Structures are given as C-alpha cells and as structure tokens.
Amino acid sequence: PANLLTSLVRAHLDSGPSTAKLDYSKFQELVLPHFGKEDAGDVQQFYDLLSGSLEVIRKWAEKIPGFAELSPADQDLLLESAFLELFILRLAYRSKPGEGKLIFCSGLVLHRLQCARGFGDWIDSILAFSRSLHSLLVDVPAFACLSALVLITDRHGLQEPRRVEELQNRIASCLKEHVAAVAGEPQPASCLSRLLGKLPELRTLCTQGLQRIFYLKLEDLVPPPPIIDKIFMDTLPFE
C-alpha cells in the first residue's frame, strides 16, 4: 500500500543503484597532497557527474503518476528548475557523510577529496546537508514523496499552475498520511514539518551550485555540456 505511495517508491528505487552494483574501482580515500588548482579532469568530472543524473531524473519523473499528464512545457520547466535540487537531494540521501563517501546514481563511488577540486567547497555544504538529512532518519516512502515534491512545485511561467498544485497536493497528502501511518510514539506532524524544513535549505544549496557553475564558466577551462549550460542560463533569473 498504497497506489500513489507505491508508484512513487518504485520510481525512486528504480532510478538508482542497488547495493550490489556499486562501483568502487575509482574510489581513493588517499589523494593529495596537491590541488588542481582546477585541473580539466576535475571540471570535466564535475560536469559528467552532473549530466549523468539528467537522463536518470528525467526517467524518474515520467514514472510519477500524473507528471506525464502536465503540459509538455510544464514538464520541461519543472524538470529544469528542479534539476540541481533533485541532484543534491538524491545524492545526499544516497551518500554516506560519516565516511566521506559520495555515491552517484550510476553506482560510482567517490571520496569527498576526489570531489573537492571539481565541486569546490560546495561538496562540503552538500555533505553537511546529507549529515542533517541522515539524522532525520527519513524512510524510503517518505523520501519518495519528498523528492517528488521538489519536482512538482510552483514555478514562474507555468501554463497550468493549478494542475501542478493539485498534483503537488496529492503528493503532500500521501506523505502526510504515510508519516502519520507510523503512529506511536510520534504521529507528530513534527516529523513532517522537520522533513519539509529541508526544502528551503535545498534551494539555498542549489544557489551554491549555480555559484560553482558561474565560477567555472568564468574561468573557462572546460565549457559545460549544453543541457547543463541551458539549465544554468534558463534558471538564472536575470535581458
């Protein structure tokens, strides 16, 4: 149970690596003593980790009941506008901040110190958020709704903002009755307002992502892939 809750759960679990398909062939806890200060390699990896999730988040979104029923312009705006947030949220939930382990959606496992030069201090902020997310001890169905709710949310330029809002309300309702379905002791709506407290912090983290990309576009060692670029420019709110 139940039918919305189970589709979400399935779309979530299907959009990422099983425990058995994790790839450690690249993971090095020891690296340094060095920097890039930015090397091409760092930057090209940063961007490749980013692009990797694109196709994955896009197929995940399609399995959300109702998402395929929004206008195609609305589907593309939600996806573009939520991309960085979904990338951070899913990374944060997937990773293991106690050990400094980042686990990407391909299955690829990397150490923080392997990510540092590419992501800059951003990786540290993501890790902090992941530490905080972990201690909320959020279950899979709660997570399945939370990420869906990051995607399905009001955005400037929506064609059918009311239909996006009814789809979001179904999801929030599903969430609310699921975290109340674990009743004793909590049943609180404290659990709830704590998990929902994680969305603004996420938006703040996304801004830090846009900051890193601005910085890398500035130095121009290696251009972003056009779809990341398009999201950067389509979502920077300023002729």
Ligand X SMILES: CCCCCCCC(=O)c1cc(OC)c(OC)c(OC)c1CC(=O)OCC
Residue 38 corresponds to which tokens in the numbers above? 């930015």
Mapped onto helix, strand or coil, the DSSP state of residue 140 is: helix
- The angle subtended at Cα 82 by Cα 80 and Cα 86, nearest 5°, is 125
If residue 57 lies in a helix (H) or strand (E), which one and from where to where?
helix 40-62
Q: Does 156 bind a second copy (CB under 8 A)?
A: no
Cβ burial, residue 48 (10 Å; 0-12/13-18/19+): middle
∠ at Cα 221 (78, 111), nearest 5°?
A: 70
Using CB under 8 A as the binding criterion, the count of chain residues that bind a second copy stands at: 13
Taking contact as CB under 6 A, which single stretch among the options 9-17, 32-40, 41-49, 115-123 is the one that binds ligand X?
Answer: 9-17
Q: Which of 128, 136, 180, 182 binds ligand X (CB under 6 A)?
A: 136
Binding residues for ligand X restricted to 182-211, rule: CB under 6 A: 203, 206-207, 210
* Adjacent-strand bridge partners of 102: 110
In 3D, which of 125, 129, 109 has the Cα closest to residue 29?
Answer: 109
Which of 90, 101, 112, 178 is close enough to bind Na ion by CB under 5 A? 90
The span of 42-50, 56-64, 75-83, 140-148 binding Na ion (CB under 5 A) equals 56-64
User: Least separation, in Å, of the C-beta of 187 and ligand X?
Assistant: 55
Query: Which residues within the stretch 175-234 sit at the binding site for a second copy (CB under 8 A)?
Result: 207, 210-211, 214-215, 217-220, 223
* Interface ranges with ligand X (CB under 6 A): 13, 16-17, 81-85, 93-94, 103, 133-134, 136-138, 140, 203, 206-207, 210, 231-232, 235, 237
